Amino acid sequence: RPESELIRQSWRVVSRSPLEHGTVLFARLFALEPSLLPLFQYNGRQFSSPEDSLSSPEFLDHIRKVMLVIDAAVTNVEDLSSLEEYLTSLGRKHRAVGVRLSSFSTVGESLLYMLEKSLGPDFTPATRTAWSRLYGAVVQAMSRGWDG
Numbered sequence: 001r002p003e004s005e006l007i008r009q010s011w012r013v014v015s016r017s018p019l020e021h022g023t024v025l026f027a028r029l030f031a032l033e034p035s036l037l038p039l040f041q042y043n044g045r046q047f048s049s050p051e052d053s054l055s056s057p058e059f060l061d062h063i064r065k066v067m068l069v070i071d072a073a074v075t076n077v078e079d080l081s082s083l084e085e086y087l088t089s090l091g092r093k094h095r096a097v098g099v100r101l102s103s104f105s106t107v108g109e110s111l112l113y114m115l116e117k118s119l120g121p122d123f124t125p126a127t128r129t130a131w132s133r134l135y136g137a138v139v140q141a142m143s144r145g146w147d148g
């Protein structure tokens with residue numbers, strides 16, 4: 001497929017420096033939906049401001065975890081049925097920590113922002129569409145962790 005190749009080629013640029021790029025993703029996320037900030041409770045404590053999260057080793061480890069899941073999806077773009085059970089369970093975990101399913105649309109927009117800003121003119125409307133489709137498929141699998 002041509003979509004699969006657009007995804008693999010664009011990801012190569014981002015996966016070079018996953019923490020730097022995942023930092024952009026989460027900075028954008030908290031700018032759009034500040035109410036996600038209290039859901040990261042490490043040591044029973046809440047971050048006051050978004051910049052507090054960037055000093056937290058546990059938060060930065062979660063950025064790495066995110067980028068690893070996306071890497072797995074890109075690696076398996078031709079057949080995502082293999083990640084399906086893992087993703088359902090990842091959904092259940094996030095439901096448990098208190099993330100609402102509607103917040104994953106904001107995460108998607110933040111991912112697209114991070115890609116747009118990293119790729120500049122190489123972020124074509126075809127590339128956007130491809131990533132939207134891939135992210136949609138990931139979220140569909142995760143959404144089974146909220147039942148359905």
Ligand code: HEM
Nearest residue numbers: 036039040041058062065066069070093094097099103107
């Ligand atoms: C609103 C968005 C999100 C919030 C508030 C959130 C929050 C959390 C929290 C609190 C944990 C448990 C503590 C930790 O391991 O750091 C967690 C675990 C995790 N999250 Fe997220 N997360 C979000 C989105 C995502 C996304 C989009 C992905 C991947 C695509 C992701 C992947 C993970 C993974 C892999 C774990 C470890 C799961 C395990 O216990 O095996 N998270 N997340």
Ligand SMILES: [Kr]
Nearest residue numbers: 026027050053
């Ligand atoms: Kr952040």
Ligand SMILES: [Kr]
Nearest residue numbers: 066070107111
């Ligand atoms: Kr993401």
Ligand SMILES: [Kr]
Nearest residue numbers: 073134135138
């Ligand atoms: Kr994705």
